Amino acid sequence: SHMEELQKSIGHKPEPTDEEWELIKTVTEAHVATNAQGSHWKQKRKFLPEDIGVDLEAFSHFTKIITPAITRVVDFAKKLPMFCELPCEDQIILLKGCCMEIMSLRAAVRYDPESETLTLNGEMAVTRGQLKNGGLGVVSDAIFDLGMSLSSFNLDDTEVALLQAVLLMSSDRPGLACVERIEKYQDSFLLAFEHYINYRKHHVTHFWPKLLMKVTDLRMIGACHASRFLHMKVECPTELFPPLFLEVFE
Ligand SMILES: N[C@@H](Cc1cc(I)c(Oc2cc(I)c(O)c(I)c2)c(I)c1)C(=O)O
């Protein structure tokens, strides 16, 4: 009985309703499925040679593995019924919007402080420099700084999945038709996410506000990548652009 605000005047911290656990199980599984190499990534990963890394040899490695990265985000979305409930133009609009946001999140949570690397596609471990010089520029710094910061959040697969869901259901992308409906699905994810955090009892003060701030930072990564993507088309050759890469980023 979502009295919600009232339960937040008394100071109780509401856990997930029965319906919310269902939504949480769906999003979680969507993610775990489409997350290249689940919990097995730290030993499955080849460090890219110190000598590689606009440095074009670098770029070519990242573009080689980017089409599967993209598609595993479309797959994450497909596995959300709310996404299925939307028109075809809206779906494409939402994906193009969140694709880098999600991929960046997936990379940043595989930050390893021992090596100072992130791991892409669960397949390849890069440094900040290698990722910067291979085309991202300062978006690399953005992602590394983020990964470094999410170290203390200790996110679990559910937390990352819900974050992905919040990024996907963004009502402000341009061109959308079903805005109010996307906002409602969003609010539904945020409400379950908060609830799930209450349940997790993280030992960090002001955990939720803090994690919402990361949504923004992800958004910024994405914006900033759009711009990097123009700087790229002029520097690297139309040749090394996987078709799907082009179609998502336009
Ligand atoms: N690790 C994620 C996927 C992921 C793949 C790549 I490859 C990547 O790096 C780039 C590099 C360039 I250059 C681009 O132009 C773009 I978009 C992404 C990032 I960050 C994330 C996953 O597990 O799903």
Curated annotation (Swiss-Prot):
Signal peptide start-end: none
Mutation effect (residue 36 to T): In GRTHD; impairs hormone binding and ligand-dependent conformational changes
Full-length numbering of the shown residues: 202 to 460 of 461
Positions of the NR LBD domain: 19-250
Entry's Gene Ontology cellular component terms: chromatin; nuclear body; nucleoplasm; nucleus; RNA polymerase II transcription regulator complex
Cell location: Nucleus
Keywords: Deafness, Disease variant, DNA-binding, Metal-binding, Nucleus, Receptor, Transcription, Transcription regulation, Zinc, Zinc-finger
Binding site for 3,3',5-triiodo-L-thyronine 1: 225
Subunit description: Binds DNA as a dimer; homodimer and heterodimer with RXRA. Interacts with the coactivators NCOA1/SRC1, NCOA2/GRIP1, NCOA7 and MED1/TRAP220 in a ligand-inducible manner. Interacts with the corepressor NCOR1 in absence of ligand. Interacts with C1D. Interacts with NR2F6; the interaction impairs the binding of the THRB homodimer and THRB:RXRB heterodimer to T3 response elements. Interacts with PRMT2 and THRSP. Interacts with TACC1; this interaction is decreased in the presence of thyroid hormone T3.
Function: Nuclear hormone receptor that can act as a repressor or activator of transcription. High affinity receptor for thyroid hormones, including triiodothyronine and thyroxine.
Disease: Thyroid hormone resistance, generalized, autosomal dominant: An autosomal dominant disease characterized by high levels of circulating thyroid hormones (T3-T4), goiter, abnormal mental functions, increased susceptibility to infections, abnormal growth and bone maturation, tachycardia and deafness. Affected individuals may also have attention deficit-hyperactivity disorders (ADHD) and language difficulties. Patients have normal or slightly elevated thyroid stimulating hormone (TSH). Thyroid hormone resistance, generalized, autosomal recessive: An autosomal recessive disorder characterized by goiter, clinical euthyroidism, end-organ unresponsiveness to thyroid hormone, abnormal growth and bone maturation, and deafness. Patients also have high levels of circulating thyroid hormones, with elevated thyroid stimulating hormone.
Entry keyword Acetylation: no
Protein name from the UniProt record: Thyroid hormone receptor beta
Region called Interaction with NR2F6, residue ranges: 46-250
Family: Belongs to the nuclear hormone receptor family. NR1 subfamily.
A single GO BP: type I pneumocyte differentiation
Single GO MF descriptor: DNA-binding transcription factor activity
Record: residues binding L-thyroxine: 72, 121, 225
